[PDB]
Amino acid sequence: DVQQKLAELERQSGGRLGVALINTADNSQILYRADERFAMCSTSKVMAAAAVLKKSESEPNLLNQRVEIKKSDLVNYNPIAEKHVNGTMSLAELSAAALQYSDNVAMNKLIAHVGGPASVTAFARQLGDETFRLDRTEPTLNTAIPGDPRDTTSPRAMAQTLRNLTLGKALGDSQRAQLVTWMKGNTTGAASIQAGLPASWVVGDKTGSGGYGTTNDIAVIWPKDRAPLILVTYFTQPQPKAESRRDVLASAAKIVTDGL
Ligand SMILES: [Cl-]
């Protein structure tokens, strides 16, 4: 019956909706188009950040290393990096900027540090994720062209990976905690999955948007007095200039958590 309501939601929205919920209470899943590929857009910032955190388990001072920010590094959306031009930022700072403000320079700096999009992809493979692929840098990774496999993953794979990163042992204790802390500090997702959940639940999420009105949110959710959930909501639309539909994500979140 949940599937019915997601299909009716997708029908009303006019686009293509991919949902994957893992309920860690009973290891159950709600899947909707969960094996289809969707452009990740900024939700891929989580994988780049984790790649850097993983590197730091072997290089402890890594997060304190400084990277220069120049005008040549600016792209389309640099809310934090633009304040630091001609200075340096630590990788920890860049990680926080990418995850909490969706800063695209920060993402490009993380990508560069671990050796480019193919290295981020190789990191995901090491975690058991054979679906994720990051192909391009910012800003082109957000084109979200229908049919284009570049910079895509599936809801099911991102839910399982995010589970590994945030609730599992893919990262060391210090590093997993850092990742969850950054995500719980996100500033950009109050209108997406969070908007479909009770005020009392705690969310750490990473949003994403791009071409074809693509609107995404990935989240680890701590309900009150319940085991955590992982929720992936991906949404994309037929028109290239379509507007973002964060409300669709909020409705999906409401639909699949009704009864928890
Ligand atoms: Cl409420």
Numbering used by the authors: 29 to 288
What are the paper's exact sentences on this?
In this work we present a drop-on-drop sample delivery system that enables the study of enzyme-catalyzed reactions in microcrystal slurries. The system delivers ligand solutions in bursts of multiple picoliter-sized drops on top of a larger crystal-containing drop inducing turbulent mixing and transports the mixture to the X-ray interaction region with temporal resolution. To demonstrate the application of the drop-on-drop method to enzyme-catalyzed reactions in crystals, we used two different enzyme systems as case studies: hen egg white lysozyme (HEWL) and a bacterial serine β-lactamase (SBL), CTX-M-15. HEWL is a widely used model system for crystallographic methods development, while CTX-M-15 is a class A, extended spectrum SBL that is distributed worldwide in multiple bacterial pathogens where it is responsible for resistance to a range of β-lactam antibiotics with the exception of carbapenems.
The basis for the poor turnover of these last-resort β-lactam antibiotics (for example, ertapenem) and the mechanistic details of inhibition are currently not well understood, largely due to the lack of structural information. Based upon the limited set of conditions tested at SACLA, the HEWL results clearly demonstrate that the drop-on-drop mixing method can be used for mix-and-diffuse studies of ligand binding to protein crystals on timescales down to at least 0.6 s after ligand addition to the protein microcrystal suspension. This encouraged us to collect a similar time-resolved series of structures for CTX-M-15 and a β-lactam antibiotic, ertapenem, with 0.6 and 2 s time delays between the drop-on-drop ligand addition and the X-ray exposure. Successful binding of ertapenem in the 2 s time point data is apparent in the Fo (2 s)–Fo (resting) isomorphous difference map, since clear difference density adjacent to the nucleophilic Ser70 appears, which allows modeling of an acyl-enzyme complex into the electron density (i.e., with the β-lactam ring open by reaction with the nucleophilic serine).
